[PDB]
Amino acid sequence: AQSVPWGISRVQAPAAHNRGLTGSGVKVAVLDTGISTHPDLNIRGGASFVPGEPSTQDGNGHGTHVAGTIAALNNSIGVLGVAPSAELYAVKVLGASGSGSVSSIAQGLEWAGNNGMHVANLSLGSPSPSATLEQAVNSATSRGVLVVAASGNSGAGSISYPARYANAMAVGATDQNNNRASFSQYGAGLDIVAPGVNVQSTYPGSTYASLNGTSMATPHVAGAAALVKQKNPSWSNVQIRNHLKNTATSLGSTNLYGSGLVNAEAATR
Numbered sequence: 001a002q003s004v005p006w007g008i009s010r011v012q013a014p015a016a017h018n019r020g021l022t023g024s025g026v027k028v029a030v031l032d033t034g035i036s037t038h039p040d041l042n043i044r045g046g047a048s049f050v051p052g053e054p055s056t057q058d059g060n061g062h063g064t065h066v067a068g069t070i071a072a073l074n075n076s077i078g079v080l081g082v083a084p085s086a087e088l089y090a091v092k093v094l095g096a097s098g099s100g101s102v103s104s105i106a107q108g109l110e111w112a113g114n115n116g117m118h119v120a121n122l123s124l125g126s127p128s129p130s131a132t133l134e135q136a137v138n139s140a141t142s143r144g145v146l147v148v149a150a151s152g153n154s155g156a157g158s159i160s161y162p163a164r165y166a167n168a169m170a171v172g173a174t175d176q177n178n179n180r181a182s183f184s185q186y187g188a189g190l191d192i193v194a195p196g197v198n199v200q201s202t203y204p205g206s207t208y209a210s211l212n213g214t215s216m217a218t219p220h221v222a223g224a225a226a227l228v229k230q231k232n233p234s235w236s237n238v239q240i241r242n243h244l245k246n247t248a249t250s251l252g253s254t255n256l257y258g259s260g261l262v263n264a265e266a267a268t269r
């Protein structure tokens, strides 16, 4: 039996699926620790920029979990992504320890724009800026990618980079009541929020696990973007981003929540 995680329901993804919108034909790059092969995932391809570790698969689990929130397959097992037909690409920019360099992340963003990705999910960040990172976000954006990135885990009232850059779409995390999660960074530059507490998804070893993080919020919006792209395949990154913000459920306090809670039903009418 397939379980629908509470966050997938809360963002109303199944309403999109019932309109025939599942992310089919939309290329989504997951810039993370890798993506493990898993019965409940379809990984179309990818690249690695982490020296000395295998170019495929995920020795941490983070990237596999994130991938499943975007695109766990719609079937009779496991979980269900926001965009279960999305074409997933595993772009390994963090090593098994879960950290990477500005270099590798930039190399991943270059790869994404050069390979025609429509959406790049970056469940990663740091509080401090980097011109190399900034230039890489701008690059992916220029080449047509919608860059979606986590606000960060510190709980404080500035958001992390690359999320904080204008051309990245910054995502914070809500809890099961839609209140800001205690670890969810907030402040100037936040675009939107999504579920990020007790988020069950795919994990290496053919299993499933629940995680807390802004890294778990992010893929809800990356998947919503894929839904909107399928419905409107000529729209730009910016048009998709703006539509997602405009159709979000306002939660007030934009310093905490940006434009509010991502709403896949409202985004795909």
Ligand SMILES: [Ca+2]
Residues within 6 Å of the ligand: 002, 040, 072, 073, 074, 075, 076, 077, 078, 079, 080
């Ligand atoms: Ca499934």
Ligand code: NA
Residues within 6 Å of the ligand: 162, 163, 164, 165, 166, 167, 168, 169, 170, 189
């Ligand atoms: Na931003």
